[PDB]
Structure 1
């Protein structure tokens, strides 16, 4: 019985990894994720220049999940590129590097640089489409023309297999349109479903106050709040993109949650809120919990059940 996977020409001890932005910003963070029992790690979404991000408090967590408006704080692309080219030990596990340029041109500039490193070391690119474009327009993946533009330009500039990080959708017509856009791009080999459920608002009843400072307390939601939304999006893309992998992200706190993701179609399973709260020991727990479920059901490998969610009649 085992949790091993072989995809994208890499080998993974298990399907678990951090969600971009959690425990991935500094060399310290990335060494910690490497030392953990996760099957892979992804670096913090980066921009060409270093960013401080939004004013604090900008992340808060509660029994049912988290809210954040971090504002893309990061050490800048050159730092993440150097970690991939010079510091990461690929004998431990594979590395994804997430990029999140604030314009299509910024993304093209980073991927042009990353390509030779991707080619020579095998670092894998996750392009974040659940990011701001022009203020007053919707985020890139909610503007299908912008999304197409970004994928066209990054595909041409990078020239190698990559994947994308998608926001959640809530309408079947949007699943159909979004998947059709992605299916135009053969280099998009994995789709990560999902980024945080956008612009929620947490209010503390005792203080009568929002809990994060930026954007009048509005921010993205993660954790237990978003699991059914995550599963839907994983399965919607798994069904619509049969030539791509789907990575699941959202609401994983247990091996049972990971099992549901995998039944929905997930190949890797990312852990954000629960990792931020529990720390990297979570990975051993999740491995143990998932293996226990597999033993009860007689499943020896992930492929035996991946995507095999049953529907009714």
Structure 2
């Protein structure tokens, strides 16, 4: 029985990795993730310049999941590029670099400089399309015209296979349109579904207060709240993008939750909130749990069940 995967010209010991933003901002974090039993790691989505992010408190977690408005705190592109070029031990596992510039030109400039390092060292690009648009317009992946412009310009600039991180959608027409846009771009080889469920609001009943400071308490949701949203998006893009891989993200706390993501179509499975709460030990647990479900069901490999969710009559 094995968890091994071979995709995007890389070998993965298992499908598990951090979700971008969790345990991946500093060299210390990346070294931690590298030392873990995860099959891969992704670095924090970066800008060309360092950012402090929003005022604290900006992340909180609860039994059913988390809320955050971090504001993209990050060490800047040069740091993550140096980590990829000079620091990361590729013998341990593959590395993804996530970018999230504030304009199309910022993203273009990053990927122009990432390309040679991608070609030499094999780092894999994940483009975060929840980057903000012009303020007062929706995030980039909720503006299909903007999304197309970004993808055309990044594809021209980078010239190598890459992937995209998508927010969740909630309407079949949006699944259709979003996937059609992505399918215009043959260099988009993987689609990670999903980013946080946007602009939720947690309120503490004792204090009668929101729990995070930015945005009057509004922030993205992760964790148990979002698993069925996540699965839907995984499966919707799995069905619509037959020439691409889908990576699952959202609501993974156990090997069972992973197994559902994989049934839905996921190749890699990313872990955000639960990793933030439990720490990197979670990867050995998730591996054991998923192998136990595979053994009970008689499955020897992930491909035996990936995308094999059954529908009713």
What is the TM-score with the length of structure 1 in the denominator?
Answer: 1.00
- State the match for 1:190 in structure 2: 190
Unaligned runs of 5+ in 2: none
Equivalent position of 2:93 in the other structure = 93
CA deviation string 1:29-54 (max 9, x = no partner): 00000000000000000000000000
Secondary structure of 2:50's partner?
coil
Q: Note the alpha carbon deviations across 1:48-74, whole angstroms, 9 max, x for none.
A: 000000000000000000000000000
**3-state SS of the aligned residue for 1:111?**
helix
Q: Give the superposition deviation at 1:89.
A: 0.2
Following superposition, the deviation at residue 141 of structure 1 comes to 0.1
Is 1:58 aligned to 2:58, yes or no? yes
Structure 1: tracts of 5 or more residues without a match: none
- Counterparts of 2:34 and 2:297, CA distance in 1: 31
Deviations 1:92-127 (A, max 9, x none): 000000000011000000000000000000000000
Q: Secondary structure at the match of 2:288?
A: helix
- CA distance in 1 between counterparts of 2:23 and 2:307 reads 29
Provide, for residues 144-165 of structure 1, a one-character-per-residue CA deviation record: whole Å limited to 9, x for no partner: 0000000000000000000000
1:182-203 CA deviation, whole Å, 9 max, x = no partner? 0000000000000000000000
Shift of 1:275: 0.1
Q: Secondary structure at the match of 2:152?
A: helix
**Helix, strand or coil: the match of 2:44?**
coil
Cα displacement (A) at 1:227: 0.1
Q: Deviations over 1:207-232 (max 9, x none)?
A: 00000000000000000000000000
Q: SS at the partner of 1:180? A: helix
Let me know the Cα RMSD of the aligned residues. 0.2
Aligned residues: 313
Partner of 1:44: helix, strand, or coil? strand
Matched position secondary structure for 1:98: strand
Residues 1:105 and 2:105 aligned together: yes
Offset at residue 133 of structure 1 (A):
1.0
- Output the CA distance in 2 between the equivalents of 1:130 and 1:64: 23
Q: Secondary structure at the match of 2:61?
A: strand
Q: How much has 1:131 moved relative to structure 2?
A: 1.8
Runs of 4+ deviating beyond 4 Å:
none
TM-score by length of 2: 1.00
Q: For residues 18 and 184 of structure 2, what CA distance do their matches in structure 1 show? A: 28
For the residue of structure 2 that corresponds to 1:52, the secondary structure is coil
Q: Secondary structure at the match of 1:163?
A: strand
Matched, 1:254 2:254: yes
Give distance in 2, aligned partners of 1:130 and 1:304: 33
Q: What's 1:237 paired with? A: 237
